[PDB]
PDB file of C-alpha atoms and ligand atoms in Angstrom:
ATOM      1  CA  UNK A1035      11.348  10.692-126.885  1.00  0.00           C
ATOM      2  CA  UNK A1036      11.842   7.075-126.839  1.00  0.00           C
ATOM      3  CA  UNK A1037      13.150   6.678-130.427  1.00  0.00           C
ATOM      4  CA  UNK A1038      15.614   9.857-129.768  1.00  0.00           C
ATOM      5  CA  UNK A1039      18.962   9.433-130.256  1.00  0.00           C
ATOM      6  CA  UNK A1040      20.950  12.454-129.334  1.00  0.00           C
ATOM      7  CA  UNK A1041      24.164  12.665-126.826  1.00  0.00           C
ATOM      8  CA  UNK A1042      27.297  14.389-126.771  1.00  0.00           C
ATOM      9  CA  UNK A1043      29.818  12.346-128.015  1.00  0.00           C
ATOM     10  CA  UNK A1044      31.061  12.823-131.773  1.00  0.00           C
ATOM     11  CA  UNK A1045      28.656  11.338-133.929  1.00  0.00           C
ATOM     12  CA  UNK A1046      25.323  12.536-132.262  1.00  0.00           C
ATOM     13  CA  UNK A1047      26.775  15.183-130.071  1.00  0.00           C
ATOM     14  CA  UNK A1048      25.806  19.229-130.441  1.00  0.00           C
ATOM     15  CA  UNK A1049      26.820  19.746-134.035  1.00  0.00           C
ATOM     16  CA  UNK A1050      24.063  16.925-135.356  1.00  0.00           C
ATOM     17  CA  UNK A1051      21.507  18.051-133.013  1.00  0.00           C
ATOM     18  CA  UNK A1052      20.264  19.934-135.773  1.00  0.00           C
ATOM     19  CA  UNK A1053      18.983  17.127-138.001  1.00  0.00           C
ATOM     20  CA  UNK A1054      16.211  16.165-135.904  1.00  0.00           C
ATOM     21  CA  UNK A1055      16.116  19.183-133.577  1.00  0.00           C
ATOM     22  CA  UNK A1056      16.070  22.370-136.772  1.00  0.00           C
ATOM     23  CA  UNK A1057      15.503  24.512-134.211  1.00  0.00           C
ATOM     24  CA  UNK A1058      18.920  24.402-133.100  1.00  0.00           C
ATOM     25  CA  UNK A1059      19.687  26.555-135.501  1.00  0.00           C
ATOM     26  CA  UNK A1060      17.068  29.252-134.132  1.00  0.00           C
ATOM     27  CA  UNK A1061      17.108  32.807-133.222  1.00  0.00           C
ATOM     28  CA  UNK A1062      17.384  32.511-129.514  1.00  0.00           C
ATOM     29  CA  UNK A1063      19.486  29.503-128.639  1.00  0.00           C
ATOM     30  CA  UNK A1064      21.647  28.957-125.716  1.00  0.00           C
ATOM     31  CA  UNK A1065      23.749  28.782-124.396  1.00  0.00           C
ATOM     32  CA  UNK A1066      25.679  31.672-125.270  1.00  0.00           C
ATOM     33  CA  UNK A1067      28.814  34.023-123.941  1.00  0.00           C
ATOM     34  CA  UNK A1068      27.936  36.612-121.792  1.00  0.00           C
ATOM     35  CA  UNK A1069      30.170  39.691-123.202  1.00  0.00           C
ATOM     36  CA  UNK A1070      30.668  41.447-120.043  1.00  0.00           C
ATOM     37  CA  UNK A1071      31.343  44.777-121.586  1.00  0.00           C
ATOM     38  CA  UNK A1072      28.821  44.693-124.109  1.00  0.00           C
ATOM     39  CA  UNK A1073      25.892  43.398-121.628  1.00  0.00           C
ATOM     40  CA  UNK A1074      23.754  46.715-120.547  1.00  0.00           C
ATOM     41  CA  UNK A1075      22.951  47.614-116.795  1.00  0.00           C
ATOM     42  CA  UNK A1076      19.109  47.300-116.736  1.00  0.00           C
ATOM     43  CA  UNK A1077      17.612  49.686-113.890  1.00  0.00           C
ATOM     44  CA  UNK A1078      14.289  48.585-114.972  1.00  0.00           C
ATOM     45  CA  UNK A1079      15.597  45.336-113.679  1.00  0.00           C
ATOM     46  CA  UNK A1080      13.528  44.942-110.418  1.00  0.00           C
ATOM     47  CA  UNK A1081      15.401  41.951-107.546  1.00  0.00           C
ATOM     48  CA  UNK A1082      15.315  38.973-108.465  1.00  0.00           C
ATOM     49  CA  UNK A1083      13.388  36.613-105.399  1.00  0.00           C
ATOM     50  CA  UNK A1084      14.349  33.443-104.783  1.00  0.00           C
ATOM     51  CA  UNK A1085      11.967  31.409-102.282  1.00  0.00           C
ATOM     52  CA  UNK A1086      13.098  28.307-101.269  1.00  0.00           C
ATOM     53  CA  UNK A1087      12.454  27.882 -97.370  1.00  0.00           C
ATOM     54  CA  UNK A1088       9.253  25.381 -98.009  1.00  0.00           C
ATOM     55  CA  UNK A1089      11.154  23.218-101.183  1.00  0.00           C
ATOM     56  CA  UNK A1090      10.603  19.536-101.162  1.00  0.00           C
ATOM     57  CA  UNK A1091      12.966  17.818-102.833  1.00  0.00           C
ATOM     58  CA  UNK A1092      11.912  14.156-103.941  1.00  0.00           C
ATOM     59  CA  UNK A1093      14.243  12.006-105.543  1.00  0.00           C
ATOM     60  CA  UNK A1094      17.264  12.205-108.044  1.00  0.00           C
ATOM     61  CA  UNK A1095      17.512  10.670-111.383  1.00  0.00           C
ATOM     62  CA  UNK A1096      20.619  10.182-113.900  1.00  0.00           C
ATOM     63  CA  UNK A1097      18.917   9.918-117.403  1.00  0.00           C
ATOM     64  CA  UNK A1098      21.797   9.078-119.271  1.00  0.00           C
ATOM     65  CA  UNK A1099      22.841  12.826-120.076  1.00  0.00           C
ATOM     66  CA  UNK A1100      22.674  14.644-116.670  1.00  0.00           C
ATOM     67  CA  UNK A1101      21.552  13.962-113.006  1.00  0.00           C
ATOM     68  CA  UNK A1102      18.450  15.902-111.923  1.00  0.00           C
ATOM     69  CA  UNK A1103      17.081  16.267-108.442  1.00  0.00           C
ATOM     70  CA  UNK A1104      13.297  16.747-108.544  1.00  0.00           C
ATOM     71  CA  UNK A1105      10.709  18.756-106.399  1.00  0.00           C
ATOM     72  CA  UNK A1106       7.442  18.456-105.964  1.00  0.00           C
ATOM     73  CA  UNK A1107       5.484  21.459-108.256  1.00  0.00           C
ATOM     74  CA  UNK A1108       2.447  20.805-107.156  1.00  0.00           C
ATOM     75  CA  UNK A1109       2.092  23.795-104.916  1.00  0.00           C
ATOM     76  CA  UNK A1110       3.754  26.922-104.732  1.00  0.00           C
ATOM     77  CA  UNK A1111       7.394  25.932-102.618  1.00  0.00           C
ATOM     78  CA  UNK A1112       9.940  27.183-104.047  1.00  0.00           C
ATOM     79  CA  UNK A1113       9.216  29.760-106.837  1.00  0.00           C
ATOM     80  CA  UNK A1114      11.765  31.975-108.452  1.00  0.00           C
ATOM     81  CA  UNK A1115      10.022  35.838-109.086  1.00  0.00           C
ATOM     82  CA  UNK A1116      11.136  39.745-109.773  1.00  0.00           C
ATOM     83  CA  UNK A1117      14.267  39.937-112.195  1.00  0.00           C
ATOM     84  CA  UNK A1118      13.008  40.573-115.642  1.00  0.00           C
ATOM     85  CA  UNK A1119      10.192  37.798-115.177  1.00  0.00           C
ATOM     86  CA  UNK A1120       6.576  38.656-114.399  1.00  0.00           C
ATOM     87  CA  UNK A1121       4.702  36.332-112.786  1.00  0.00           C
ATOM     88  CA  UNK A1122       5.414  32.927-110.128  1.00  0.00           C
ATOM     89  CA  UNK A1123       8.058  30.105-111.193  1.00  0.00           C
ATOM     90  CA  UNK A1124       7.987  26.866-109.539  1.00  0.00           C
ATOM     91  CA  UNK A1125      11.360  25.044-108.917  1.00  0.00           C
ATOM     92  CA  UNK A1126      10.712  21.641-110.737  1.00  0.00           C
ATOM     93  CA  UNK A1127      14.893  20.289-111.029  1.00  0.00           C
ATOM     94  CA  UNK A1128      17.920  21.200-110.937  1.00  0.00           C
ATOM     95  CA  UNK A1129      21.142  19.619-112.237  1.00  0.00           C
ATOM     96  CA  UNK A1130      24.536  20.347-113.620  1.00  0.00           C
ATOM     97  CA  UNK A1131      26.727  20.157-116.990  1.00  0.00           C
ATOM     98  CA  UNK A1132      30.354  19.580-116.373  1.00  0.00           C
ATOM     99  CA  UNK A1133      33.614  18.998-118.096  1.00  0.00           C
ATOM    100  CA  UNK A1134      35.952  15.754-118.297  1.00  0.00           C
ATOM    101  CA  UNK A1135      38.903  18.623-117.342  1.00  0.00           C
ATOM    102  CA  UNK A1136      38.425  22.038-114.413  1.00  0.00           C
ATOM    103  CA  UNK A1137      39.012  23.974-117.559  1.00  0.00           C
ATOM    104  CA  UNK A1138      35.833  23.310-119.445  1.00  0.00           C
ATOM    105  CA  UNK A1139      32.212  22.275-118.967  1.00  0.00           C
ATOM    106  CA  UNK A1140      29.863  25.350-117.988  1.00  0.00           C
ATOM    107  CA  UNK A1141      27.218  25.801-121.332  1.00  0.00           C
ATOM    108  CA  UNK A1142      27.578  29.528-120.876  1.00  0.00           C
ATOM    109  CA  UNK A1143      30.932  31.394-120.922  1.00  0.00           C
ATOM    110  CA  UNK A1144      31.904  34.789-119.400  1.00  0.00           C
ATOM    111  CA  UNK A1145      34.132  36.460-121.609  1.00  0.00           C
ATOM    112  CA  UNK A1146      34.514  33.440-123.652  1.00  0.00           C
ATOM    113  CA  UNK A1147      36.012  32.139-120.131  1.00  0.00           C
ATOM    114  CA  UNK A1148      34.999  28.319-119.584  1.00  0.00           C
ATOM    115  CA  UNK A1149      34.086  27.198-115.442  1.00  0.00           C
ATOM    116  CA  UNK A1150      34.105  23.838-114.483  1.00  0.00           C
ATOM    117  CA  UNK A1151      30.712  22.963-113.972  1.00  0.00           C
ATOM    118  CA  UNK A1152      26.985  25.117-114.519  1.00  0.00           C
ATOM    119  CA  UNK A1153      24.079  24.688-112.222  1.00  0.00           C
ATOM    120  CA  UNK A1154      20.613  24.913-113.767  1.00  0.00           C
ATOM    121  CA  UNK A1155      17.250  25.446-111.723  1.00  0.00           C
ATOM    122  CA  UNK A1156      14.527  24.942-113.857  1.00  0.00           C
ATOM    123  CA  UNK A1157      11.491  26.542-113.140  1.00  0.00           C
ATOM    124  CA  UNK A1158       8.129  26.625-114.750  1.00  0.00           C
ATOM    125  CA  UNK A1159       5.447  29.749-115.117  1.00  0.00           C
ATOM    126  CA  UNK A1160       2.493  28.698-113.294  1.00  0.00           C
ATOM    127  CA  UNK A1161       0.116  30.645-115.536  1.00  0.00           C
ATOM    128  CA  UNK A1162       0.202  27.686-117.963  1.00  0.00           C
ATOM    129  CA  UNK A1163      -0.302  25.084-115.241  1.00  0.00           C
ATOM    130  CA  UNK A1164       2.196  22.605-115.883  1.00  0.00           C
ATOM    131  CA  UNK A1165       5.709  21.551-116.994  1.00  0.00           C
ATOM    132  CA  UNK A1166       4.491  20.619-120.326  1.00  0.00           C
ATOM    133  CA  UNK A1167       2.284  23.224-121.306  1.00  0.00           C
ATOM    134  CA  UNK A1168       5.178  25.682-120.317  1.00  0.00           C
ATOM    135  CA  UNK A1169       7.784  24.322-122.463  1.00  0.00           C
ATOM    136  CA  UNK A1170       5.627  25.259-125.126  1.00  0.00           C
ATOM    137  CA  UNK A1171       5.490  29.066-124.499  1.00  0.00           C
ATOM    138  CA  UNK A1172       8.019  31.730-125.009  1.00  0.00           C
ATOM    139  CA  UNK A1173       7.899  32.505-121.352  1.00  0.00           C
ATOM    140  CA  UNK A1174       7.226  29.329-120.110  1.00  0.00           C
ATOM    141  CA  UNK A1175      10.313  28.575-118.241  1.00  0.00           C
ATOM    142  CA  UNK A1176      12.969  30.881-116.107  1.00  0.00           C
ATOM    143  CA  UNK A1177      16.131  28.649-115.719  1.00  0.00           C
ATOM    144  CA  UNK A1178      18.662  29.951-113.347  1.00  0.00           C
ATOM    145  CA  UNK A1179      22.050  29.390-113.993  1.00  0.00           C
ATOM    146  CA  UNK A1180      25.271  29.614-111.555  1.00  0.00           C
ATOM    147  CA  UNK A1181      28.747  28.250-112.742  1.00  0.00           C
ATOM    148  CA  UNK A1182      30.418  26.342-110.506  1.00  0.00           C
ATOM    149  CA  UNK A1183      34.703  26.845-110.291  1.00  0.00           C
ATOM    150  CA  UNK A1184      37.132  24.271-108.634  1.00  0.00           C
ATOM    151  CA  UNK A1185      38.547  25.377-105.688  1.00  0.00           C
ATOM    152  CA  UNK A1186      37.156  24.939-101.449  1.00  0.00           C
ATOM    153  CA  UNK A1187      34.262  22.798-101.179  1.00  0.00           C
ATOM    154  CA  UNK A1188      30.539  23.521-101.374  1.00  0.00           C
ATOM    155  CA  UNK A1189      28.924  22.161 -97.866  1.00  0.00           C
ATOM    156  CA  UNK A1190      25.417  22.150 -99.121  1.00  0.00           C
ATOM    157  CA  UNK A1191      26.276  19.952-102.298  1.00  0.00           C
ATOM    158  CA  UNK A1192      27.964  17.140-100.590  1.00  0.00           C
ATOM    159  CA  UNK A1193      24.707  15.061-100.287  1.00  0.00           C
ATOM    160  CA  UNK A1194      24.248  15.120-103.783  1.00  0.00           C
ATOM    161  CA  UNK A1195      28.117  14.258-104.014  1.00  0.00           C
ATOM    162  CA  UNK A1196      27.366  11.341-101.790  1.00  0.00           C
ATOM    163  CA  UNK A1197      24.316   9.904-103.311  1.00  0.00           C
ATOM    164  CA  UNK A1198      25.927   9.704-107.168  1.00  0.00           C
ATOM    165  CA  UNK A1199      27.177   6.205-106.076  1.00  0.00           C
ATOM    166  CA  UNK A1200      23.696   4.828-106.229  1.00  0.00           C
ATOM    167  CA  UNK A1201      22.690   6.253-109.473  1.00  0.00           C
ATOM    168  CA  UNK A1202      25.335   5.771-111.287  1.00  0.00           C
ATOM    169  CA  UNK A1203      24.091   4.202-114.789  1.00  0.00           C
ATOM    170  CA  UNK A1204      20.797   6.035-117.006  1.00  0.00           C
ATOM    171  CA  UNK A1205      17.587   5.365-115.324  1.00  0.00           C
ATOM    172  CA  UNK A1206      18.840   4.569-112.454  1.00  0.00           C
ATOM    173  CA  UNK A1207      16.978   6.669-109.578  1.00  0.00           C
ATOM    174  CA  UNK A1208      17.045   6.727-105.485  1.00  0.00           C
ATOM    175  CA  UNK A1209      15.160   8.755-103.229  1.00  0.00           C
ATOM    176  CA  UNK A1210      16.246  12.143-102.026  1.00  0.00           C
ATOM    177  CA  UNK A1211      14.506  13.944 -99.877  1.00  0.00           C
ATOM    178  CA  UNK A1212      14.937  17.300 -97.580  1.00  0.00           C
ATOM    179  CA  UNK A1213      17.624  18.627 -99.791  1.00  0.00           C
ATOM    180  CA  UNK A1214      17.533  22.298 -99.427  1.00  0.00           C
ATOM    181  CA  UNK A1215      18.703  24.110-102.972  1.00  0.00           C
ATOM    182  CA  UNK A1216      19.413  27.342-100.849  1.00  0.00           C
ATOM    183  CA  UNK A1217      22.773  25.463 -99.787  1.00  0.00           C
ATOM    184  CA  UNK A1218      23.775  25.376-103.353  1.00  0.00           C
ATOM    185  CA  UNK A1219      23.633  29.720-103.883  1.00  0.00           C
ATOM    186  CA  UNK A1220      26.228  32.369-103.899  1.00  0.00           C
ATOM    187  CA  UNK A1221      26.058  35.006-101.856  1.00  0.00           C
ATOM    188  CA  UNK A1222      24.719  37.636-104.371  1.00  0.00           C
ATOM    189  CA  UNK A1223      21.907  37.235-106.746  1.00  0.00           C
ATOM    190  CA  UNK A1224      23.462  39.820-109.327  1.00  0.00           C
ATOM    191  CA  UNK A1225      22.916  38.674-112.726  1.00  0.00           C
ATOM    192  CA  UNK A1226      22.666  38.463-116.543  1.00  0.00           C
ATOM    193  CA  UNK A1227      19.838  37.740-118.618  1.00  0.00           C
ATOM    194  CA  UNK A1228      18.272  36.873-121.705  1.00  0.00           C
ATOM    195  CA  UNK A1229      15.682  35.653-123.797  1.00  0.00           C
ATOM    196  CA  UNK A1230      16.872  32.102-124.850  1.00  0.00           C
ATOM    197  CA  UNK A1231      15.627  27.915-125.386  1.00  0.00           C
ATOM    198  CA  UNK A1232      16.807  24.904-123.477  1.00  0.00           C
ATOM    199  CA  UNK A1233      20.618  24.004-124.165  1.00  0.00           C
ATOM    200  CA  UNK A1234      19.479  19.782-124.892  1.00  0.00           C
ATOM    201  CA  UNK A1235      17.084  18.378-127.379  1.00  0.00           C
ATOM    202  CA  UNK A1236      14.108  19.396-127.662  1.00  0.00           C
ATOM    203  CA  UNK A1237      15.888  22.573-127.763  1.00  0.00           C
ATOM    204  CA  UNK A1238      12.316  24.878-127.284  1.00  0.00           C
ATOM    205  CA  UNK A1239      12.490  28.763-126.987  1.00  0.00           C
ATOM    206  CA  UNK A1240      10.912  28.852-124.045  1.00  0.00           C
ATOM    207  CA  UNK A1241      13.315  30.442-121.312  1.00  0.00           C
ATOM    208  CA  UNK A1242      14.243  33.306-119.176  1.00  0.00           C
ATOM    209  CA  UNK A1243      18.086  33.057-118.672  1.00  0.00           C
ATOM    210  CA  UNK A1244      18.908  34.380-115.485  1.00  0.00           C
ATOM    211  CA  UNK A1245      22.838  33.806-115.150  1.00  0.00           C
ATOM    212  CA  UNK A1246      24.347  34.413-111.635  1.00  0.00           C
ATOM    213  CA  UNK A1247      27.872  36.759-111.936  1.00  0.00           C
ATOM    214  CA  UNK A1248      29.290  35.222-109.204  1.00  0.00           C
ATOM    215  CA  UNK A1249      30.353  31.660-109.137  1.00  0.00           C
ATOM    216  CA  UNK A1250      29.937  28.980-106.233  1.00  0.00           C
ATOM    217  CA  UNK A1251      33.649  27.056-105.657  1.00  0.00           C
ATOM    218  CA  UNK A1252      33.363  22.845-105.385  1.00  0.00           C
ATOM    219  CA  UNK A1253      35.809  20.970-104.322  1.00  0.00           C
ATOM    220  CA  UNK A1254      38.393  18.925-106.683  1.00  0.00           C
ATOM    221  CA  UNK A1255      36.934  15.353-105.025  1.00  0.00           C
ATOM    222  CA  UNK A1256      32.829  16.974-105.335  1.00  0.00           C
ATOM    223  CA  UNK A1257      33.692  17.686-109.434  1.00  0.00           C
ATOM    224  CA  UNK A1258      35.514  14.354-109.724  1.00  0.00           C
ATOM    225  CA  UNK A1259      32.934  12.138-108.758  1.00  0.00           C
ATOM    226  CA  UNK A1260      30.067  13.863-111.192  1.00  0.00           C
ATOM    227  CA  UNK A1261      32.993  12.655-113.511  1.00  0.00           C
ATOM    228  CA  UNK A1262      32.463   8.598-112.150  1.00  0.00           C
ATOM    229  CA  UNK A1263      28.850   8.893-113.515  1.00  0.00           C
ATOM    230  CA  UNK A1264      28.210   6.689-116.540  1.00  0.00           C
ATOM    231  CA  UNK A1265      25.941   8.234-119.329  1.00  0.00           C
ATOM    232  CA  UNK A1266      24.951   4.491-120.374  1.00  0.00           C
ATOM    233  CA  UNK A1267      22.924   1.865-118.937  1.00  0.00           C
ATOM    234  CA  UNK A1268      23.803  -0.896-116.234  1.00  0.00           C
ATOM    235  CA  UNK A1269      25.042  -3.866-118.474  1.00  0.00           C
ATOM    236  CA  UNK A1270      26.877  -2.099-121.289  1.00  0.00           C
ATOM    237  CA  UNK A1271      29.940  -0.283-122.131  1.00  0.00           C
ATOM    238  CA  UNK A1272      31.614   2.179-120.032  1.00  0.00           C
ATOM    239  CA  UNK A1273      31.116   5.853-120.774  1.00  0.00           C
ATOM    240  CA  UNK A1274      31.796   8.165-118.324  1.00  0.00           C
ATOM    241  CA  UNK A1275      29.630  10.912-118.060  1.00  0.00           C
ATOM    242  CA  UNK A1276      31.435  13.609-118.804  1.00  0.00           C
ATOM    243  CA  UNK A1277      31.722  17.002-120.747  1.00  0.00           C
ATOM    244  CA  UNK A1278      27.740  17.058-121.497  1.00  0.00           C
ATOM    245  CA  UNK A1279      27.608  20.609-122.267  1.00  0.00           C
ATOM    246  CA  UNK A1280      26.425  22.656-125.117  1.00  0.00           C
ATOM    247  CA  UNK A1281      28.974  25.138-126.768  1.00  0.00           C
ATOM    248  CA  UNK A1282      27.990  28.640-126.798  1.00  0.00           C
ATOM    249  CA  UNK A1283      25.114  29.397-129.983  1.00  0.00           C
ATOM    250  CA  UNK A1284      25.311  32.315-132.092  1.00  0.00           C
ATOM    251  CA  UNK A1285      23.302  36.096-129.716  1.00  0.00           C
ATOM    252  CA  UNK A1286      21.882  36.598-133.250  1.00  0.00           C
ATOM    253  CA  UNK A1287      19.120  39.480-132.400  1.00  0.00           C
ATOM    254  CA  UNK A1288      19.196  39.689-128.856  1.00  0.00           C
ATOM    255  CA  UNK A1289      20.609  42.193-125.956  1.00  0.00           C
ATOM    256  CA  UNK A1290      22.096  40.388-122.475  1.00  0.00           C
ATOM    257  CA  UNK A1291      20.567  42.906-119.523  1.00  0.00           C
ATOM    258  CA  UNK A1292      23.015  42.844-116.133  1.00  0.00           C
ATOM    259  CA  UNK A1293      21.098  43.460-113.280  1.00  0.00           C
ATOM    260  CA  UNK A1294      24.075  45.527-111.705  1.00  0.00           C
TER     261      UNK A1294
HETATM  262  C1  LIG B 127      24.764   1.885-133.717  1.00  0.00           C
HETATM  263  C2  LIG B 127      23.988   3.052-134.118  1.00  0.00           C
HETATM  264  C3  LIG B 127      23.361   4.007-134.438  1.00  0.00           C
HETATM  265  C4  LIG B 127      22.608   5.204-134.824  1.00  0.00           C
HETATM  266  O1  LIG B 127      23.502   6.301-134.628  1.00  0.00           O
HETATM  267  C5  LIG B 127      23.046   7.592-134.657  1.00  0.00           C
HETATM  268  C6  LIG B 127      23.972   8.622-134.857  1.00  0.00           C
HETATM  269  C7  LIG B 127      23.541   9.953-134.885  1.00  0.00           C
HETATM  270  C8  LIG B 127      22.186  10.259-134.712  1.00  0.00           C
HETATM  271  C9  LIG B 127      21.756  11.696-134.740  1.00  0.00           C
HETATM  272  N1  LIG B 127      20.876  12.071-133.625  1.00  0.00           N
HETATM  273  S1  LIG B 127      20.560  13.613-133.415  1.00  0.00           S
HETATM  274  N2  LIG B 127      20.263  14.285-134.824  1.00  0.00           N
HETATM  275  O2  LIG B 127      19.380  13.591-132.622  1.00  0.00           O
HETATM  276  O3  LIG B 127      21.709  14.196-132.819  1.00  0.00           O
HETATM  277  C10 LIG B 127      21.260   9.229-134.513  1.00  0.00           C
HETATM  278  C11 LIG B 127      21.690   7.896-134.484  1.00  0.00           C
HETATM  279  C1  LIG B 128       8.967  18.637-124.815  1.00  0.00           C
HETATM  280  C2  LIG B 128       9.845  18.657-123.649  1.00  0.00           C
HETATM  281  C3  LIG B 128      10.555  18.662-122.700  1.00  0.00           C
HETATM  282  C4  LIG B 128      11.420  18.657-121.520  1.00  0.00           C
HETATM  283  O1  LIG B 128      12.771  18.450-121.943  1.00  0.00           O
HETATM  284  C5  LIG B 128      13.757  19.104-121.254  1.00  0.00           C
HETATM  285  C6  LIG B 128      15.014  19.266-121.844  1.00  0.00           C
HETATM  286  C7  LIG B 128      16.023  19.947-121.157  1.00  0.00           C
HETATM  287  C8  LIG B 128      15.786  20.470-119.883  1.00  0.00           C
HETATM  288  C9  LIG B 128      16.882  21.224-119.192  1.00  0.00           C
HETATM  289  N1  LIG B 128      17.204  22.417-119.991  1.00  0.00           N
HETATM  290  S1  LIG B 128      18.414  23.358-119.584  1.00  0.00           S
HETATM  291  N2  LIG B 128      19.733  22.501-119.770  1.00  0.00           N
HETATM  292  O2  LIG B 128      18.328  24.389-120.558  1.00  0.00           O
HETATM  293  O3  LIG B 128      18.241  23.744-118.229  1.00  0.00           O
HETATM  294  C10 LIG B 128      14.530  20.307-119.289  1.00  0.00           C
HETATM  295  C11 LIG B 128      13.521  19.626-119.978  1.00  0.00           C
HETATM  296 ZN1  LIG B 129      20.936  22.396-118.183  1.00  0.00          ZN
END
């Protein structure tokens, strides 16, 4: 990826994608809106399991078109199971999409209904052994989504809030360990899901989309400063890093299951 060029702004954001990326035009991209009323109760659906107790969080990283906090994958810590996915997925990062205004920035919609912000923990199937292998299978990767609205403050995502400061330009990185991802959950795990690709160049069909239903509220202040972020480098122009989300893609052949 070092000759890509790809971002959101308006001459190589999501509608040139496709030049380099054809599979943006697929038959399972995503993001994509999540009809409520058309979206059928699965009872086949088993619970979904979320383990996180033994995560270990390592550092964070802004690489110039999202933050991402990475884990360590090297064992079995924090895997995602049950749901519609068979098998054990590790948590290898998790970071956020968000809008320049409270009334946009999630990549999926409800409804056609916009949130602030969407949380993304990506996981890996560790029947293929790694990160890259996975990317490159239909099931490789089950990437759990949970929108985030303005409105009281989220306790357990005020050390990320805090740490943005020193990462504020692409590539810059700083260590972050002993963050615990539980603090950043709803209370239920009742969800949507469906057979989709990742929402940012390369664009592969290789996720499970497990979308939460019910939103986590952030604070005005914790959404603002994701908005300070700079998508370029130290030592050039100004661009806050904002609105790097995906529009909703076209459902095409493909049936969202709701797990309640
Ligand atoms: C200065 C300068 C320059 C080159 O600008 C671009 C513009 C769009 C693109 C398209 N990239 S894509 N197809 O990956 O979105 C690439 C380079
Ligand atoms: C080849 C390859 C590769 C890895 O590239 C990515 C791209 C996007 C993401 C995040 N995808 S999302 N936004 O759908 O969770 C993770 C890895
Ligand atoms: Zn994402």
């Amino acid at each position: 990826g070092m000759s890509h060029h790809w971002g959101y702004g308006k001459h190589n954001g999501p509608e040139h994608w496709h030049k380099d990326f054809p599979i943006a035009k697929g038959e399972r991209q995503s993001p994509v809106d999540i009809d409520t009323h058309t979206a059928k109760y699965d009872p086949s659906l088993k619970p979904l399991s979320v383990s996180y107790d033994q995560a270990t969080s390592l550092r964070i990283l802004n690489n110039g078109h999202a933050f991402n906090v990475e884990f360590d994958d090297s064992q079995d810590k924090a895997v995602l199971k049950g749901g519609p996915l068979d098998g054990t997925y590790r948590l290898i990062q998790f970071h956020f999409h968000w809008g320049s205004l409270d009334g946009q920035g999630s990549e999926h919609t409800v409804d056609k209904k916009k949130y602030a912000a969407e949380l993304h923990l990506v996981h890996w199937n560790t029947k293929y052994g790694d990160f890259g292998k996975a990317v490159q299978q239909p099931d490789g990767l089950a990437v759990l989504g949970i929108f985030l609205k303005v409105g009281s403050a989220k306790p357990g995502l005020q050390k990320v809030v805090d740490v943005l400061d020193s990462i504020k330009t692409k590539g810059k990185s700083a260590d972050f360990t002993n963050f615990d991802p539980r603090g950043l959950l709803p209370e239920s795990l009742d969800y949507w899901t469906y057979p989709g690709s990742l929402t940012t160049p390369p664009l592969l069909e290789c996720v499970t989309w497990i979308v939460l239903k019910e939103p986590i509220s952030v604070s005005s202040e914790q959404v603002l400063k994701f908005r300070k972020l700079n998508f370029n480098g130290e030592g050039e122009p100004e661009e806050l890093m904002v609105d790097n989300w995906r529009p909703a893609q076209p459902l095409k052949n493909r049936q969202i299951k709701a797990s309640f």
